[PDB]
Symmetry: D2
Subunit: 231 residues, 4 copies
DNA sequence: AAATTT
DNA sequence: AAATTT
DNA sequence: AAATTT
DNA sequence: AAATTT
């Protein structure tokens, strides 16, 4: 199996696998059962912003998710990523639907990593039809309105159930090194989750994986395109 | 009195005012009596690097100080800087000598601040004779070898005792705002502390202050050009 | 008198001082009489973007101004800024109105300067607060209204006033050139909203570089754009 | 055949294929026969810096190469890269030796590309590790030796070998131009150490931009710099 | 998040 | 750039 | 950090 | 750009 560290924006409570009873943000270390969660007032139809940060000094993975004119949700977990991730990784965005569904639209995505200095930075404020610096997996597409659609959306603009897709940055990323004084990363993305159903599902995740990571077979719904099972 | 938050590289133990019995790095919140310290193996004559980081999510001020081919020293303190600093500040470097002395040479200095986005970034890898974007206070000079000398150094290159000087970035910095989702800063500087005396003193500090801050009268030696007294 | 280098977005043709017969973008080297101009299809009430670039290798000051879904206007002029500007400068935005008027609203402003090893400065304003301590506001310029910078006077309902002039300068001096530098470069970007009830909106917005102690010249409303003491 | 745009630091004059009679810097548009060259006082055994710049407004590819306390060499060529390169490219460093030889050591490399609202990419290498997974190494190129990138073969005591060619390409494709972009720009910087026991060191280093699937052309040691399949 | 069961 | 060919 | 005092 | 002066 892949090695996955993720931040989940989980729109749907799967209480059978440890989700709290409300939409939440969570920190996922090699399991869909979040090591840490916080309540998230997801706003159907509104553009949200997610901010993820980590540095080798505090070794604390932190995320903040917000909408304009609303209180943020924030979650943090103390984890030494040198003990979890390989030295080289790919970074990406994942989303899924199940028997309930939602648009999982990404409007922008930026990432910065630094090791003390070697740096990498990318910013996408628009996605083109042929975005050669992204690896699209499963149902993910680019070019529609200059957005990245992680999960399948029909020609009438309706989201489809039982969909999964991911976008990974083409270049491997040097996320830690034994000889580094300080290492840090940050990621930012803006997203639009819309459901015509009473209940949106299943969520979006920022993730870091082994370089050769692929969607686990059957990872639609509550597995968010990240995990082969709910252990 | 000014409002000061600083990271001290304290070369000289002033045990009468709570310094530990060894050269240390410390986090100073409105007092020279550090809220937190760590042991620092200062290397007389060698170029060192200091890295300071803070963000509004973790509200943890952290510093790392290192030399090539040596173990780092690191110190962190949980502090909400919105409760300590004014919304607008100046950032700077301070150094002092007393009855013992050292060169307090800065080879480079960079700073970045971001509020969610408004950003400010400066980098100095060399200092010119007439560096109009620095406010030099007390004995601080620029232009000698392209370095910033925070404290007085005679024409034969010998450091002088009972010296204090500071360099502040000209523009005020927006360090926090009630309406910001995320706020962060980082600072990096490289430094050369040399003493021909058995004992170097007194140290270098990165500091953040009220915009109109000036060297407190008599703040040579253990007060590091930051505090009017040892309370 | 100040030393000024500017890029003008000139909404109003002052034919008596060398302006062409249409709204234009111009490069101004120590004179309101542009060394170079290009036709500019200014879109009343629409958000525009201006991009200014220079480097010590090409020694060409270039600007592009655009609106979404419309053709850009671009102008370039070969000038060695080492022979024109002092080594240390302030950078800023200026705007004016006269008999005719317009909102001179700035929604965002960013600047980067680098000298090569490397000295750099970068600022970005995507919002302006009521108390923007890293800006020097001159004349009628105000911040805080909808998070925007209003270079010239507007009323409580957002209606522009005539006979207005204001400027915003970045607080820190900028090291724009150095004789011992291998490469020096700058870029600036700003987004702007020029809106007018008038048949002919006036007078325009400029990005400028000046001596550090520059102030609005006395009487510099209307066609002088808050930059020049006269039309020479 | 690949599509190549390069800046050559050409240490060896191949007069039979249009090189001038001295070490030169050149701009190469789909040919080893530079569209433009300038004299280059290459300093055997000293660390040099190369700076390459381009933007879609001036459409001028410019380079500067310098050593500390010495006069720069600079070359520029007016070219619209939209008419030459594919929209997506890889960027890289190439070097070669032939009968004569030199170390082609890279100490650092950085690149920035931006399309305007804005898409950006930036990387910086100030050290190279033994397993540099975000570089595609081609031919003799190796990383890890003193934290440097060695584009061509050197021995365990650091002595250069003849008849060598290697390249390092950034792993991710780069969006170098787009028809709907207002402004597009790139810059690259690298520091290099060219050292030789030979009377005439050869053959040089190049920064290049290519089709994403570019490889060292067969036989491209010596004067072809690992870029061109022939001297046309 | 709102019924339906123990 | 230096030697050799024409 | 190394003496000098309790 | 439109009106008025020369
Ligand atoms: O505040 C709570 C509002 C949202 C919950 C309202 C509906 N809840 C609910 C459940 N719960 C049991 C979960 O099973 C549902 C079906 O599972 C499939 O679909 C989901 C969503 O796409 C996915 O996570 C699973 O992996 C799977 O594909 C109901 O049965 C019901 O109604
Ligand atoms: O690992 C420890 C090595 C360094 C200490 C060795 C010398 N210690 C020492 C002291 N301690 C008492 C402190 O007073 C010294 C004089 O104080 C003046 O000088 C210092 C240094 O510049 C400064 O912090 C003060 O503010 C003041 O200016 C001795 O008396 C002695 O010897
Ligand atoms: O074909 C497209 C437009 C052509 C020109 C239209 C000009 N209309 C116009 C003029 N022209 C004379 C210019 O000065 C008159 C007013 O001068 C004052 O106002 C302007 C604008 O604020 C300013 O630049 C000056 O400095 C001064 O304050 C008219 O008189 C008229 O109507
Ligand atoms: O006045 C300053 C230098 C002037 C030229 C000096 C050249 N010396 C020289 C030549 N010239 C003929 C060129 O080709 C000979 C060797 O060709 C092989 O080696 C080079 C260098 O590695 C390479 O560019 C080629 O592609 C080929 O591999 C001599 O024969 C000689 O000596
Ligand atoms: Ca879930
Ligand atoms: Ca002390
Ligand atoms: Ca005008
Ligand atoms: Ca050659
Ligand atoms: Mn969950
Ligand atoms: Mn201390
Ligand atoms: Mn004009
Ligand atoms: Mn050549």
């Amino acid at each position: 199996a892949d090695t996955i560290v993720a931040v989940e924006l989980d729109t749907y409570p799967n209480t059978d696998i440890g989700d709290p009873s409300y939409p939440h943000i969570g920190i996922d270390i090699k399991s869909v059962r979040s090591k840490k969660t916080a309540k998230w007032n997801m706003q159907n139809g509104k553009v949200g912003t997610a901010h993820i940060i980590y540095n080798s000094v505090d070794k604390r993975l932190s995320a903040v998710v917000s909408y304009p004119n609303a209180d943020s949700a924030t979650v943090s977990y103390d984890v030494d990523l040198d003990n979890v991730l390989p030295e080289w990784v790919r970074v990406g965005l994942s989303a899924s639907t199940g028997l309930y569904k939602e648009t999982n639209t990404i409007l922008s995505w930026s990432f910065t990593s630094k090791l003390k200095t070697n740096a990498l930075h990318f910013m996408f404020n628009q996605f083109s039809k042929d975005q050669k610096d992204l690896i699209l997996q499963g149902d993910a597409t680019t070019g529609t309105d200059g957005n990245l659609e992680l999960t399948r959306v029909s020609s009438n603009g309706s989201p489809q159930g039982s969909s999964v897709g991911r976008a990974l940055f083409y270049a491997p990323v040097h996320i830690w090194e034994s000889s580094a004084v300080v290492a840090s990363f940050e990621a930012t993305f803006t997203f639009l989750i819309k459901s015509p159903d009473s209940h949106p599902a299943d969520g979006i995740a920022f993730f870091i994986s082994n370089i050769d990571s692929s969607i686990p077979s059957g990872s639609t719904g509550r597995l968010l395109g990240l995990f082969p099972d709910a252990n």
